[PDB]
Design a protein around this ligand. Structure first.
Ligand code: NA
Ligand code: NA
Lengths: 240, 249
DNA sequence: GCCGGTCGACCGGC
DNA sequence: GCCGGTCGACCGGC
């Protein structure tokens, strides 16, 4: 992580601050200026850097990585229609809120905020299916050290007309034991967790993480089918 | 439906209205639907949380979640409209219920103990058609089972009002609307999108409205469809989420 | 045309 | 503590 080394610095400027996400981005731009991009900014930048090549087929080649292409591309129509006159704009569906890249390595950073006084209810983080596809591409293309997917969480609470940061957490998806990732099938098959709760004890290689995750995904998919019968058919058979 | 008699008027009043440009961009239109209804059907119109607040305010001596739950006088309505036990226990005139993201209805229209649960469906018509979540297929299955178990087939309807809009400068403007009743549709043709919060999905504008059976028959037919679709999904999950990845493990 | 996956953010049962 | 359902619409591949 490019963020990890300065995490203490980020924690310092946030804990106690009253008003949060922009604060993190601002700090990143000032201390990691040559690395910090918003995702849409990275795409525009990348295409604006090769005004020669046009079309979505050629532009897709610019990512020079099937896995990277899969995680960051905007789609054929949008890519085809991209021009300096028609630039990309912030779209929630951009996997990374903040993108840090250096020497072809990428850190997909997601910054989250949390009302620490509203009782825990893990939010959707990312599709378990999208993650499975990502792991498959990493394995198929042997891309095991191209990128990381990390999270920064800012905890706050109410204080008059001001929300005050009270704590922060940083975690890396690929440092978590795959089997400990909660896949909430009903909730858009989304992995759910509060960053402070994410496990960080995995000790193997990225390839091993990928294979372990896929084993977890397949296993939980089978378990979900079993749970669907027990919860959605068994209780209603008597009405048929 | 209590709003159908005046739907032509609602349609006329809504078309042309605007909301400042910015979840879901057009959600603010739901507030304009409430306004018109409250002005034209003043004594029948309530936000779900308002109805709850009015019901409890009216019975100050009724304390505790168990006693307050009895105020609904219906297991099916209790299931569809009530808030949780702690929230119900903690309610007070000084701590009223407020809007809640997962409440079943956007607006409730009630008269002489019959309820119309209205859900406004906003739609950006400048983009390609993408059927929105309507209601959880599982919540609906439980609803049907409760209607059957308690013989509550003439107590409530679940209806939808689609509000179509498009971006126009700094505003979002309503260009058209449609109205449909869930219980007039063919239950066996309802699309259940399991991944999307197990939601039934359809465009109000296109919903068939020719169901010829009784409400009890609707509920039984829906449960048959729900069960069949859940069984098929259990098997199809292997084909799409297991089969493709087993080669990597 | 057809088809269904995705992100955002939430309570409450026992 | 453990577990997971619900609302909101909303897009892109072929
Ligand atoms: Na709605
Ligand atoms: Na709904």
């Amino acid at each position: 992580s490019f963020i990890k080394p300065i995490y203490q610095d980020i924690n310092s400027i946030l804990i106690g601050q009253k008003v949060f996400e922009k604060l993190v981005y601002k700090f990143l731009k000032e201390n990691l200026s040559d690395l910090t991009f918003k995702q849409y900014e990275y795409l525009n930048d990348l295409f604006m850097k090769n005004p020669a090549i046009i079309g979505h087929e050629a532009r897709y080649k610019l990512f020079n990585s099937p896995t990277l292409l899969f995680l960051l591309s905007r789609g054929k129509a949008a890519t085809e229609n991209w021009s300096i006159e028609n630039l990309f704009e912030e779209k929630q569906n951009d996997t990374a809120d903040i993108l840090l890249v250096k020497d072809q390595f990428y850190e997909l950073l997601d910054v989250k905020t949390r009302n620490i006084s509203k009782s825990a209810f893990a939010p959707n983080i990312i599709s378990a299916y999208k993650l499975a596809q990502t792991c498959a591409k990493m394995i198929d293309n042997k891309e095991f050290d191209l990128f990381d997917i990390n999270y920064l969480e800012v905890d706050w609470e109410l204080n008059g007309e001001d929300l005050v940061c009270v704590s922060t957490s940083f975690a890396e998806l690929f440092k978590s034991e795959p089997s400990e990732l909660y896949i909430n099938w009903a909730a858009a098959m989304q992995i759910q967790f509060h960053v402070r709760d994410l496990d960080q004890g995995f000790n193997g290689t990225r390839e091993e993480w990928a294979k372990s995750y896929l084993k977890h995904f397949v296993t939980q998919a089978e378990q979900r089918a079993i749970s669907m019968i027990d919860k959605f058919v068994k209780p209603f058979k008597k009405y048929i």
